[PDB]
């Protein structure tokens, strides 16, 4: 537990737990406790500062909108009807953190230093390819079950919040989840660029629930697979099989997932309902063009023939493929889809006749609301652009969530690079420096 014996300094002291399964178990369980702790403590915090009639995205909340999306404590339009489910989630997560915190400490500073001669089932070796895939299998099944919990919630227990629900957003039970692999895996084969958007562009709960059904069965089957099998030859020669190497593989995964989450909460308004998280970037911008189209048309303006300074339509123009879109700088956001705008959308895009006659006041309210709540804010939470004066205390939750998980994702990519590079060097035997006396370069022919 010092540097002379372990070979690691205090700033790398957790690297001494590599070959100590017992204490390492206590470390992970204790860290897990910290996770469930925050998930509960913050929930109670958010609920304590929560104001029912005031919008969620105006109160700096990130956890309550997650619970609300699952259909708990909300009704039509995303209005809060009962704050009690928020309280239960916060309390249960919190109490559980004491349980994980109890065994986390026990397994760490008094549980067996190694599990290998307490138990052959719990005890492991990093280089035991069979043991690792087995543990991988177990946890794969656990993840598969968790995905089915979401399915069970959406199909059997109340359902989820459907922002695309007819008559307005409401909690809806998913009865027909999409099982079609042409749709589910169709998302996975979509382009990550504009107009497509990969898996981020999922716009209905049917594809979400049906999607988690697939990934549920896949992880379970995969779990059973890795439990019953052992790594093939081509896999044994490709990877590095060590504790640090496995960590780096997971660091790269979480880094990728971090970047994906960043794009989800910033672009997607289905699994991240605008009634809870606030309008997206593209959404708010389209709402401004919407807001002033309505205002000007009331004054007697013909928004279909209104030419702008550049020659392009002031309110309405065409996308590169010909779709009728909102004019101005928001031409870049013509791939935005929202339940408040789709009623005005025809086969060729925005229908001018629907615009002239069918626009409803609730659409006008929502447009002005989302325009004035665009995800633009300073670090000290001053709403609007940088040149705006102090008055509105607002930064959209989407901004907090997108920024935070990009910082984390990037650093975990660095983590991947750091821990994978060292895993290669360590397994090869030169992570502690070049042997002065077998310097590989000196045995190589000169470059010139």
């Amino acid at each position: 537990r010092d540097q002379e014996s372990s070979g690691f300094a205090w700033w790398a002291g957790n690297a001494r737990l590599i070959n100590l399964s017992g204490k390492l178990l206590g470390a992970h369980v204790a860290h897990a406790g910290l996770i469930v702790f925050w998930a509960g403590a913050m929930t109670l915090f958010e609920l304590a500062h929560f104001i029912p009639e005031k919008p969620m995205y105006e109160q700096g909340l990130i956890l309550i909108p997650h619970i609300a999306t699952l259909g708990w404590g909300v009704g039509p339009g995303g209005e809060v009807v009962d704050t009690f489910p928020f309280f239960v989630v916060g309390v249960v997560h919190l109490i559980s953190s004491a349980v994980l915190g109890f065994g986390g400490v026990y397994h760490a500073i008094r549980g067996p230093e190694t599990l290998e001669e307490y138990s052959s089932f719990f005890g492991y070796d990093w280089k035991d390819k069979n043991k690792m895939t087995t543990i991988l299998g177990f946890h794969l099944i656990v993840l598969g079950i968790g995905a089915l919990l979401l399915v069970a919630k959406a199909m059997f227990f109340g359902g989820l919040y459907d922002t695309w629900a007819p008559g307005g957003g409401d909690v809806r039970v998913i009865t027909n989840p999409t099982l079609d692999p042409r749709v589910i895996f169709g998302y996975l084969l979509k382009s990550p660029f504009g107009g497509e958007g990969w898996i981020v562009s999922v716009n209905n709960l049917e594809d979400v629930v049906g999607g988690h059904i697939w990934i549920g069965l896949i992880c379970i089957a995969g779990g059973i697979w890795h439990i019953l099998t052992t790594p093939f030859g081509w896999a044994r020669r490709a990877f590095i099989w060590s504790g640090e190497a496995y960590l780096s593989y997971s660091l790269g995964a979480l880094s990728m997932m971090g970047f994906i989450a960043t794009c989800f909460v910033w672009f997607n308004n289905t699994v991240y309902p605008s009634e809870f998280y606030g309008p997206t970037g593209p959404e708010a911008s389209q709402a401004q063009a919407m807001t002033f189209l309505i205002r000007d048309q009331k004054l007697g303006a013909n928004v279909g023939s209104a030419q702008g300074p550049t020659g392009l339509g002031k309110y309405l123009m065409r996308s590169p493929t010909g779709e009728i879109i909102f004019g101005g700088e928001t031409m870049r956001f013509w791939d935005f889809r929202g339940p408040w705008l789709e009623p005005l959308r025809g086969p060729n895009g925005l229908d001018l006749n629907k615009i002239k006659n069918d626009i409803q006041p609730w659409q006008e309210r929502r447009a002005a609301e989302y325009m004035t709540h665009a995800p633009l804010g300073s670090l000290n939470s001053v709403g609007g652009v940088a040149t705006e004066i102090n008055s509105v205390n607002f930064v959209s939750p989407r901004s907090w969530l997108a920024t935070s998980h990009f910082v984390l994702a990037f650093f975990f990519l660095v983590g991947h690079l750091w821990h994978a590079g060292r895993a290669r060097a360590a397994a090869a035997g030169f992570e502690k420096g070049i042997d002065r006396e077998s310097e590989p370069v000196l045995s190589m022919p000169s470059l010139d």
Binding site: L299, G300, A306, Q307
Partner: protein
């Protein structure tokens, strides 16, 4: 080579509200003109004279009373193409 807009500032346009050219947001400077009467005036433009605004079909007696009170704040000049195109009368691109 003359700037037509600058030249128009040398007329009554630079003095009063031109019913045939001036942006619709100018009808806020006076009482009971915006936005109902304001919409009607611009829609029924142009006019040969100022008092022709009283001949707009559908005007109530109170509305025609309000118009008469603000005839002194109105004027009529030749229709300038550069001021009426692009729906600039309803939105000339100026805000705050």
């Amino acid at each position: 080579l003359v700037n037509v807009v600058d030249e128009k500032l040398g007329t009554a346009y630079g003095e009063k509200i031109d019913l045939n050219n001036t942006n619709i947001a100018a009808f806020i400077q006076y009482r009971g003109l915006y936005p109902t009467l304001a919409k009607l005036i611009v829609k029924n433009a142009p006019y040969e004279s100022v008092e022709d605004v009283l001949n707009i079909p559908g005007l109530t007696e109170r509305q025609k009373q309000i118009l008469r009170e603000n005839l002194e704040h109105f004027t009529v000049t030749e229709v300038e193409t550069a001021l009426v195109e692009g729906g600039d009368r309803y939105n000339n691109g100026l805000y705050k």
